[PDB]
Amino acid sequence: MERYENLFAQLNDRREGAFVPFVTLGDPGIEQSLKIIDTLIDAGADALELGVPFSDPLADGPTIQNANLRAFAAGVTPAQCFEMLALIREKHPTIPIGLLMYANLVFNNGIDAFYARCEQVGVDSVLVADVPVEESAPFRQAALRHNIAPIFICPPNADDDLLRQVASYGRGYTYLLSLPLHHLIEKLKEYHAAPALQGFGISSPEQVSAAVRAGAAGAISGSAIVKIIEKNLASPKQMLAELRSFVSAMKAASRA
Amino acid sequence: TTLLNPYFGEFGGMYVPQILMPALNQLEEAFVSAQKDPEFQAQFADLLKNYAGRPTALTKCQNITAGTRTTLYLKREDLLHGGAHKTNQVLGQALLAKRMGKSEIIAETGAGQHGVASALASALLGLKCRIYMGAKDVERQSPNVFRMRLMGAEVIPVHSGSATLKDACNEALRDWSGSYETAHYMLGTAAGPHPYPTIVREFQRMIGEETKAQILDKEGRLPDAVIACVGGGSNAIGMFADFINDTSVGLIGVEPGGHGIETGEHGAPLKHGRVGIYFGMKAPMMQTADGQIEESYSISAGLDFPSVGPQHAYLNSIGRADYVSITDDEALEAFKTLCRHEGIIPALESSHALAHALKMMREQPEKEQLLVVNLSGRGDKDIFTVHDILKARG
Numbered sequence A: 001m002e003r004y005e006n007l008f009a010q011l012n013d014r015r016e017g018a019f020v021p022f023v024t025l026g027d028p029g030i031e032q033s034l035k036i037i038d039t040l041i042d043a044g045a046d047a048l049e050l051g052v053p054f055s056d057p058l059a060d061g062p063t064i065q066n067a068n069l070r071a072f073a074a075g076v077t078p079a080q081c082f083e084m085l086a087l088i089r090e091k092h093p094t095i096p097i098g099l100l101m102y103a104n105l106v107f108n109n110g111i112d113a114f115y116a117r118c119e120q121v122g123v124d125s126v127l128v129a130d131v132p133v134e135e136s137a138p139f140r141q142a143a144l145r146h147n148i149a150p151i152f153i154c155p156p157n158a159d160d161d162l163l164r165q166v167a168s169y170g171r172g173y174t175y176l177l178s179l180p181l182h183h184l185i186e187k188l189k190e191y192h193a194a195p196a197l198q199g200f201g202i203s204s205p206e207q208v209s210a211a212v213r214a215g216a217a218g219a220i221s222g223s224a225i226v227k228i229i230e231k232n233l234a235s236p237k238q239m240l241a242e243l244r245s246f247v248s249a250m251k252a253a254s255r256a
Numbered sequence B: 001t002t003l004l005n006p007y008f009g010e011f012g013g014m015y016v017p018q019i020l021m022p023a024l025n026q027l028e029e030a031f032v033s034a035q036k037d038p039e040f041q042a043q044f045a046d047l048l049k050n051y052a053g054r055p056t057a058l059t060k061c062q063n064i065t066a067g068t069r070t071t072l073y074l075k076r077e078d079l080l081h082g083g084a085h086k087t088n089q090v091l092g093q094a095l096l097a098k099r100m101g102k103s104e105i106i107a108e109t110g111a112g113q114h115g116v117a118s119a120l121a122s123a124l125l126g127l128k129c130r131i132y133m134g135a136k137d138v139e140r141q142s143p144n145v146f147r148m149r150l151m152g153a154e155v156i157p158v159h160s161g162s163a164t165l166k167d168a169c170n171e172a173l174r175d176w177s178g179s180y181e182t183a184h185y186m187l188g189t190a191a192g193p194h195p196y197p198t199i200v201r202e203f204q205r206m207i208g209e210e211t212k213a214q215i216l217d218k219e220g221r222l223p224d225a226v227i228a229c230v231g232g233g234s235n236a237i238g239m240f241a242d243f244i245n246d247t248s249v250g251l252i253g254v255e256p257g258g259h260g261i262e263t264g265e266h267g268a269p270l271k272h273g274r275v276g277i278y279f280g281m282k283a284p285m286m287q288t289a290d291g292q293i294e295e296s297y298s299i300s301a302g303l304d305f306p307s308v309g310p311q312h313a314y315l316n317s318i319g320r321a322d323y324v325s326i327t328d329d330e331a332l333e334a335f336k337t338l339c340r341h342e343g344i345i346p347a348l349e350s351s352h353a354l355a356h357a358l359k360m361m362r363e364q365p366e367k368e369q370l371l372v373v374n375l376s377g378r379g380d381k382d383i384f385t386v387h388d389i390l391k392a393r394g
């Protein structure tokens, strides 16, 4: 979680927002996915959110459903995803890396063991998509024992009790999906929550700037990156060019 | 559909190809949002004070009115950073571009002042700036082209049409239609398609707000009239806006009369043109009988444009503002008079406004009147122009 603390301190000093792309690991293959992720970083991503393909991604809409299918078609497994994570961390020592996981993949071989593997490869946070705060105890506990930030979603239908739990329980950042927005953001700060990243349908530069203006620490593009991969499957080179240009533009919007 | 009224009576509108409408709608939305955002206002105010130097002086000019019953003040936009009022609105537009998450600026320029203003605002605020300028204007304005390059802008000569300001104006719009996702078009006057006449007015309206406070402090009443030159309309609407609802205050805009209205060599479409549609707006313009856009002329490149912003056409139509013209010779006499009597070198653009105020005084020297001229810019840039005319003249 320390990489996030360092990142947000750096951005705060520059009066700048964070821009964080999501991609599915191994979409559309391992080699291309590694290149995609390097492109995202070189173009100015501040952190990554990386999904491990799961058979049943309940929290995910059609774009990410299709990305999971492409990765499975390429034979991607969680073991291969952890190999990729080691390679990414090896090339990029400071960028915060967050995983988007489904509960079964974390519980499968033991929750403690999963977080220990995260710590060993150099992952910084884990968001378990189908674990609400009410069910979160063993996940958050194992995360913190292994120096992993447990990331929680603050949904649009969040009440005060939930804001307080997410503020207490989370580290790294709060994943905001958005009570009025100003209220959610104010309350999270009042409750000393992890800095908020707005993740609701972020697909254009102006949305990044608006998120920062609203008081959020930055924005997460939950599917726009994946859409670019999907739109350009037939041409890997053009895919990278379009990713670089998009991330470039989104990051530019976060600058003071 | 729009958030704000695109028209001033019958004038104005959004006469652009369909592909540009999302750009104009996005900008209008960002502007409406910015105008309700105290943080945006505070940022803009901070740049205007600490970078550009606002508030500007209001100077009482005693020598030039001596022995008449005119009291003349000059609002000193010539003291703003950059040497003209253009700096006010380029700072606001640069802030809007950043609000929208844009990293790049496109601008047109004729005289080159707007190019320089766009470039300096871009330099300060970390935006990548490109400027379009008719090839004829490029050749005429080597000092300004060099300034733009020093400030890190790219200058792109325009060879289409008449290779002058209107052609630069068209090319800026052409570029933006392709680039608006990443680039903001920093239009240089209170004209063009909505929302620009409205944005530029609001980002220049501090001129009249300061003038009102300053004249109240110094004279305990409002002016009898405020007088400003009109090239596209920004300095004049910035001076006029805060006085529109003070119905006793006269609003006088001065168009360039060139070699004389009767010669056809002028830039006075509001009084001597006819309504047409060009540059995204329905507005008075100089045009041929068959509806081609005419070439304007003024000694002052800053006033040399064959149309005018739509709010001025509207204020004239309802009789709220009165529009007059001043010839090259009248402007040159005012330029000389201000240098000699007050030690201020005015822009030849501003000299048209001063010339008309001098005419108001001289025609009726026993009329009691309290006048403010918007001195929109300084005239160091004009000394070569003025030298050359005086020499030719003998």
Ligand SMILES: *Cc1c(COP(=O)(O)O)cnc(C)c1O
Residues within 6 Å of the ligand: B083, B084, B085, B086, B113, B114, B188, B189, B190, B229, B230, B231, B232, B233, B234, B235, B236, B302, B303, B347, B349, B350, B376, B377, B378
């Ligand atoms: C550009 C300029 C003008 C004319 O433009 P408006 O938009 O009509 O104000 C007038 N005076 C100066 C000094 C200028 O630089």
Ligand SMILES: N[C@@H](Cc1c[nH]c2ccccc12)C(=O)O
Residues within 6 Å of the ligand: B108, B109, B110, B111, B112, B113, B114, B115, B165, B187, B188, B189, B191, B231, B232, B233, B301, B302, B303, B304, B305
């Ligand atoms: N020619 C002047 C003023 C100007 C800029 N853009 C305009 C558009 C219309 C009329 C005048 C202008 C300049 O470039 O500094």
Ligand SMILES: [Cl-]
Residues within 6 Å of the ligand: A059, A060, A129
């Ligand atoms: Cl999610």
Ligand SMILES: [Cl-]
Residues within 6 Å of the ligand: B035, B036, B037, B038, B041
């Ligand atoms: Cl406000």
Ligand SMILES: [Cl-]
Residues within 6 Å of the ligand: B142, B143, B146
């Ligand atoms: Cl030079």
Ligand SMILES: [Cl-]
Residues within 6 Å of the ligand: B216, B217, B218
């Ligand atoms: Cl007083």
Ligand SMILES: [Cl-]
Residues within 6 Å of the ligand: B224, B225, B248, B249, B250
């Ligand atoms: Cl009056």
Ligand SMILES: [Cs+]
Residues within 6 Å of the ligand: A167, A168, A169, A170, A171, A192, A193, A194
């Ligand atoms: Cs916390």
Ligand SMILES: [Cs+]
Residues within 6 Å of the ligand: B053, B054, B055, B056, B057
């Ligand atoms: Cs001052």
Ligand SMILES: [Cs+]
Residues within 6 Å of the ligand: B065, B066, B067, B068, B069, B070, B071
């Ligand atoms: Cs006097």
Ligand SMILES: [Cs+]
Residues within 6 Å of the ligand: A209, A252, A253, A254, A255, A256, B098, B099, B100, B101
């Ligand atoms: Cs911004």
Ligand SMILES: [Cs+]
Residues within 6 Å of the ligand: B230, B231, B232, B255, B256, B267, B268, B269, B303, B304, B305, B306, B307, B308
């Ligand atoms: Cs004009």
Ligand SMILES: [Cs+]
Residues within 6 Å of the ligand: B164, B295, B296, B297, B304, B305
């Ligand atoms: Cs001209």
